[PDB]
Design an enzyme around this catalytic site. Sequence first.
Site, PDB file in Angstrom:
ATOM      1  N   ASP A  48       0.812  -1.188   0.000  1.00 28.46           N
ATOM      2  CA  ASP A  48       0.000   0.000   0.000  1.00 28.46           C
ATOM      3  C   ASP A  48       0.872   1.276   0.000  1.00 28.46           C
ATOM      4  O   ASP A  48       0.355   2.371  -0.103  1.00 28.46           O
ATOM      5  CB  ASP A  48      -1.028  -0.010   1.127  1.00 28.46           C
ATOM      6  CG  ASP A  48      -0.434   0.272   2.463  1.00 28.46           C
ATOM      7  OD1 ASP A  48       0.759   0.194   2.708  1.00 28.46           O
ATOM      8  OD2 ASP A  48      -1.323   0.642   3.315  1.00 28.46           O
ATOM      9  N   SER A  50       2.785   2.272   2.432  1.00 27.71           N
ATOM     10  CA  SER A  50       3.111   2.799   3.750  1.00 27.71           C
ATOM     11  C   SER A  50       4.369   2.079   4.141  1.00 27.71           C
ATOM     12  O   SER A  50       4.813   1.140   3.471  1.00 27.71           O
ATOM     13  CB  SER A  50       1.984   2.588   4.735  1.00 27.71           C
ATOM     14  OG  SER A  50       1.773   1.181   4.834  1.00 27.71           O
ATOM     15  N   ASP A  52       6.768   0.582   7.615  1.00 28.58           N
ATOM     16  CA  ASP A  52       6.773   0.219   9.060  1.00 28.58           C
ATOM     17  C   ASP A  52       8.084   0.604   9.685  1.00 28.58           C
ATOM     18  O   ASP A  52       9.079   0.470   9.031  1.00 28.58           O
ATOM     19  CB  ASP A  52       6.568  -1.287   9.244  1.00 28.58           C
ATOM     20  CG  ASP A  52       5.215  -1.714   8.810  1.00 28.58           C
ATOM     21  OD1 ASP A  52       4.267  -0.955   8.732  1.00 28.58           O
ATOM     22  OD2 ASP A  52       5.195  -2.963   8.473  1.00 28.58           O
ATOM     23  N   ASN A  59       3.288   1.495  11.799  1.00 26.49           N
ATOM     24  CA  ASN A  59       2.871   1.879  10.466  1.00 26.49           C
ATOM     25  C   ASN A  59       2.615   3.347  10.205  1.00 26.49           C
ATOM     26  O   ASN A  59       1.906   4.012  10.932  1.00 26.49           O
ATOM     27  CB  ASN A  59       1.690   1.021  10.043  1.00 26.49           C
ATOM     28  CG  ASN A  59       1.332   1.218   8.606  1.00 26.49           C
ATOM     29  OD1 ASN A  59       0.423   1.956   8.284  1.00 26.49           O
ATOM     30  ND2 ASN A  59       2.039   0.537   7.744  1.00 26.49           N
TER      31      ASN A  59
END
Length: 129
Positions: A48, A50, A52, A59
Amino acid sequence: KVFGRCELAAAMKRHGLDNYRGYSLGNWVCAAKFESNFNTQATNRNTDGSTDYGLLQINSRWWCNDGRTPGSRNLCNIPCSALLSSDITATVNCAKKIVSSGNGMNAWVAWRNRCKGTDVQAWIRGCRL
C-alpha cells in the site's frame, strides 16, 4: 541500535510496558524480536506504500508521519524517524496508543502469528529485572 534481549526487556519495563493493558513483558519482547530482530532502525515498506518503522514496526498509514504516505493519520504525532532512535521512548509511547486502540496486541501481525499463545515468559527468562 541493536538491543540485547534482556537489555530490551529492562528498558521496556522502565518505560512501563510490563503488563500494560494486560500484556506481560514477555509479549512485548517477543514482538520486538519478530518485528525487527531488536533493531531500532528496521524499516519495511508495504505494498500500500506505507512503511513500518522501529522495533515494533509501527505503520506510517496510521501512526506516524513520514511525508510519503498519502492520507496518513499521524495518530502518535511524531515523525516516523523518531521510531528509529536508540532511545525507545517514542516507540513505547506510540505502542501504548496502538495497543489501546481496540484490538490489543493483535495490531502486530508478528505477535499474533508468532507470540500469541506461546510461552512468552521465556523471552524475559534469565533477565535481571
